[PDB]
Structure formats: structure tokens, C-alpha cells
Design a protein around this ligand. Structure first.
Ligand SMILES: [Cl-]
Ligand SMILES: [Cl-]
Ligand SMILES: [Cl-]
Ligand SMILES: [Cl-]
Ligand SMILES: [Cl-]
Ligand SMILES: [Cl-]
Ligand SMILES: [Cl-]
Ligand SMILES: [Cl-]
Ligand SMILES: [Zn+2]
Ligand SMILES: [Zn+2]
Ligand SMILES: [Zn+2]
Ligand SMILES: [Zn+2]
Lengths: 179, 179, 179, 179
């Protein structure tokens, strides 16, 4: 009765809008729907309940016994703990829809999406349009000073000129570490 | 260089939201994007130009020489004429995205989506959630007086109690003609 | 309980192999499966029954009361009659899988695939690889004397040097009529 | 120029047949194609070169400079080492198609498919048909003595009555460990 759907892809691939589109179908069928998003839409009075959380554990603190469809956006902000949470919810008969990043800016697998992709019934990898060539993009390009971020530049970075854009694998560049 | 993408499915399957999601990817790649819709969204100053039209012929009256991506929503409101228009635009190097109904309320193929599906590079049939059983829906149920519309009830209907909801083929009912 | 799945695309896109792959899943689940193909695979003793036919009408002459899954390959060799046949079979609780051409060599919609795409629950447009550039192909290129067939060359053609290959829309060429 | 396509799903979902179908499209476009499979199809004289291997490292020992398309079947028989091998081949301009199991019989993510799904441009999760209910399956059911394998039963098992069949999550059962 319950299953998991996984939506992934780079930044700017429309993951969040796709998650919302599928939750909206829940509303037209008069189902109860909620979405969880990291802390740090209605039709005929029935509405998507949105819920900000700091930790994946907060999900089970909510009463979900009457909820048909559970969304979870930006899953890369959580741990592999969210994997067992999502399996349990799907075994308790919920439709569960998770969205988040497949890779980080370096092109490295972004926990916990690998495992979610492996255990989910459905997987949809969305692609954006490369800011360079206009072909299908697959990667998130991080720029620091109009230049390709380095493999070892940290994610917390104070006062830096920082931008993100989608790129194809060919146009994606991770600059080498310094020494 | 140009191609066609077709988005179809019943009412309430999210066709319009999916068309917008794909056009938004155009904006993040700094492409120029427009959408046409029947008469009767920005990021960094670059915006989807929306354009209401009465007739498919109006499309060619617009200057489209710098437009990367052309959307066309609710194509069932137009004729098979839109087929050659969309082939020409795709041959002139545009990415073209059409959305509309696959079938009418009777379950009959809704012109001009059949031909567009046949000539398009990509086809995506979206499914909603059946208002009866909660399975994947495929059809638009028309109700008149809380009852299934008849195969021959007209679409223009004055003063009637009229509703639409998505249903699976099993729960979709077209009532017989009277005599 | 019954539905339709449509598999389409150009020649050489693997439609026939995809139809067989999906019918084989029927066998591993111990379902009874048949495939119809135009006239003019087992596992643990349970086998796909293959059936050659001249006319779509022959389908209803077969006893199908115990058949879970009905395949129909090369549907372009049949008429729009096959549309109501496939709707009836799906309404009688069968899973029905149709494969055939979306367009002919001219790029024109190939009856009866448009209507089938419109009324089917699922649609899968397969793409081959362009014999010229190696990108995703969408069209069937007909060659006569190492040259692009003409829009009006007939399909019955005696003694001619005739070849077919998949191409992208850009590399697909229909030569003009003579006068 | 190069990319990765990932084909996954349970046993009996047709992963191997889908991998072959996509490699065959390479042949019709006159591309050179090879497939690697664990040790322990032609058209107009141009043929898929099949190659049995014990170790993922053997792949780089082969001369691949003229190969357009590289297949790799049953990737669960290899290590995460195959991840960097597949990224390198895709960065050297090859189309790479990997197939293998998403989960093991226990429902646990099957290395190295998680990471491959995360770094691949395309992901296709195929589904079989549940041997119990006939709905879409997602899991591989292991049976020992007509009974559900236990979470801790090993995979090497001498003289046991052992069968596998695809099941939906609901009908999939992992029996508890003994003590
Ligand atoms: Cl990132
Ligand atoms: Cl999607
Ligand atoms: Cl309608
Ligand atoms: Cl989509
Ligand atoms: Cl043809
Ligand atoms: Cl497919
Ligand atoms: Cl296994
Ligand atoms: Cl596929
Ligand atoms: Zn690019
Ligand atoms: Zn229903
Ligand atoms: Zn081409
Ligand atoms: Zn089942």
C-alpha cells in the first residue's frame, strides 16, 4: 500500500517544483498531504500542510496516522537516519516523496540520496540546462570570484563572491587543491 | 537544433505546472523564453514572457527570432493548424514545449494532441490520482448533478451543476445517450 | 483492472525488443501472455504464445478469457479499428501493450498510433541513434539510390536500391516532389 | 561528450535485456560497442563485442580508444572501484551504460549501485510483476524451503532448496534472525 518516490538532480533542475506538483495531485483527490523542509498551496479549503524541521527525528514526533502523502524536500540537509524513517513510513502505508541533490558541487554523491535512490520504488533524475552550452546539465557548478571552486574549498565561506549554476559534465570544473 | 516536447494527460494531472517547471529551467540558463495560452515568473530580471491568444495563427505574428524556448499551454483550445506551426518552429531551431489534454471527458482523443504526440521528439503522459480509489488516474470525469455526464451532453451548458475530477479508467463513466 | 501501454518511435528504436522485455516480466510472474504480429520465449514451461494475423479483427476470434497480458507489435500495419479493440480488451481487465511507428518515412503521423497514444494510460517514445551525427534520432530516413526518398515516392517500389536508417530531425530529409 | 546511464531494479526486471536493447541502437548507428559481464548480437557484420571479467580493473587493460559505447552488466558483482572507472570512461568521451541490482534480497542497498545512481546522468529503475498480487514489484524475494529467507542467512548456501522471485514491498518478507 505505501511506496517511495525519489526526485533528484542538480541545483536548479526544479526538484522542489516537481515535489509540489506531485503533492498537489494529492489535494485534487481530497487526500491529506504534508511536506517537511529544513529550517536552518490549497484547493477547495484542503491544503498542503508545510512543516519546517531542524532534524529528521522531528518527523516521527508529528501525528501522521491520517496523512496519505508525505513530502520531504532538500533531503541532503539530513542524515542516512532519514532512510529508515522513510522505509517505516512507506511500510505504514504512506506514499512518501523525497527530493534532494544527487551530488555536491564537487560531483561527489550527496548523502543520503544514494541510499534513498537504491531503496525507492521510483526514481526521477531531473536535468536543468547548462549555463554554458545550453545542453542538458547534470552538475551544480560553484563559482568563487567568477572562478571554479576548488575540490577542498569549504561550504561555509564568509565574505566570498559566490555563485551557483547548472552545467553539463563537460563544462563542470572542480579546480585542484593548492598543495 | 530544435525539437518538440509534448506534455499530456487528464485535467488536474499538473500539465500547466510541468510546462512552467521546464520553461523555468530556460531562465536559469539565461535563455529567452515565452509561453502562449488561450485568451477566451522571473529570475535575475530575465522573465518568462506570457502571451494570451485567440488563434494559433497569432503565434507567427510575434517576433521569435531571439526566443530559445516556446511554450504552448492548453493546446486542445486550438486546431491541427498548430501542428505545422510547431514543426516549423522546431525546424527553425526552437525548443518547443506543448501541453494539453490527451482525451476529452468522453475518453475520445482530443485534437490536436494525437498528431503532436506522433510528431514530437518527447512525450510525457502525466497521471493524477483517482478521486474514487486513489490509484493513478487517466481520464477526466465530468459530473452533471452529482451524476456522470452523458456521451452526448454538450460542453457549453448553461445553469447546470457541473464538476470535473480525475479518475482511473475503471471509475470513469460515460452515461448512455437518452434515445 | 485493465490498461494500455503504448511503445513508439522510429524504425530501429528497439520497439519490438521493448515489447518482448515487458511481456517477459509477465512470464516470471506466472501470468499467461500472448503477442499478435502482422503476417503478410519461455521460462519454466510457461511461454509467450506468438500469433501471426492479417487483420485486426482476427484478435477477437481468439479465446482470451485466461490471458493476463496481450501484446500487439507493428500496429501501423493495422487500421484505427484496432483502437476500439484495444479499449475493449483493456475494459475487459487485460493489460494491453501496443508497439508501432509514430511517423512514416515522410515524418507524417502513422495511423493508428496517434489515437492509441491519446487513449493509452502509458506512452513511451523510444529514440535510436542518428546514423549521421550520433545524437538521439527521432525519424526513419528512407534512402533510394543512396539519396533521400521523395515526399511522393510510393512504399511498394520494385527493383529499387532501398535502405532505412534512424536520423535526428535535422539530418532527416524528405526530397521535394518532381512537378 | 561522454555520459553515464544507469539501469537498475530487482532480479527479473529485465535489466540485462534493456542494457542489450540500448547497446543494439549503437550497432544500427554503425558505432563500436562492447559489453563487460562477470565471469565467475550483430547487424551488417558490426557486432557487440562481449567480454567476461573477474575484476573491474580488467576494464582499463582493454584498448577502448575506438569504442563509442561501453556496457557493464551485473555491476553488483564488482566494488565501488567501478565508480571511478565509469567516471573516467565517461570523461574520456564514452557513452557508458551500467546495469545491476538496486537492493539485495534483504532490501538493503546493493553496492555499488547507490553511488552509480548518484553520479549518473540518467537513471532508469525497472520494475517486474509481483509473483503474489501481480502489481509492480520492486524487491527480490529469496525463498529457502518454500519459506522467506532470514535477514542473516548467507548467500553461499550448499544443498538448500533455493528460489528467487520478484515481489512488491508489501509481499516481500525478510524473516527475523533466530537468536
Ligand atoms: Cl552543493
Ligand atoms: Cl518527473
Ligand atoms: Cl473535456
Ligand atoms: Cl515530467
Ligand atoms: Cl515508413
Ligand atoms: Cl521503456
Ligand atoms: Cl540478492
Ligand atoms: Cl527504459
Ligand atoms: Zn555544457
Ligand atoms: Zn479509481
Ligand atoms: Zn543527426
Ligand atoms: Zn505484491
Amino acid at each position: 500500500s505505501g511506496w517511495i518516490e525519489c526526485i533528484t538532480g542538480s541545483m536548479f533542475s526544479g526538484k522542489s517544483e516537481e515535489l509540489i506538483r506531485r503533492l498537489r495531485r494529492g489535494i485534487y483527490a481530497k487526500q491529506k498531504v504534508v511536506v517537511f523542509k529544513p529550517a536552518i498551496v490549497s484547493h477547495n479549503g484542503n491544503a498542503i500542510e508545510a512543516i519546517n524541521i531542524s532534524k529528521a527525528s522531528e518527523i516521527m514526533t508529528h501525528d501522521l496516522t491520517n496523512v496519505d502523502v508525505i513530502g520531504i524536500d532538500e533531503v541532503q540537509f539530513f542524515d542516512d537516519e532519514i532512510v529508515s524513517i522513510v522505509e517505516k513510513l512507506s511500510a505504514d502505508g504512506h506514499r512518501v516523496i523525497v527530493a534532494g541533490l544527487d551530488m555536491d558541487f564537487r560531483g561527489e554523491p550527496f548523502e543520503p540520496m544514494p541510499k534513498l535512490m537504491a531503496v525507492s520504488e521510483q526514481v526521477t533524475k531531473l536535468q536543468a540546462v547548462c549555463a554554458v552550452c545550453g545542453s542538458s546539465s547534470s552538475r551544480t557548478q560553484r563559482l568563487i570570484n567568477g572562478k571554479p571552486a576548488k575540490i577542498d574549498d569549504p561550504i561555509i565561506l564568509v565574505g566570498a563572491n559566490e555563485s551557483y549554476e547548472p552545467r553539463c559534465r563537460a563544462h563542470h570544473i572542480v579546480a585542484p587543491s593548492d598543495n
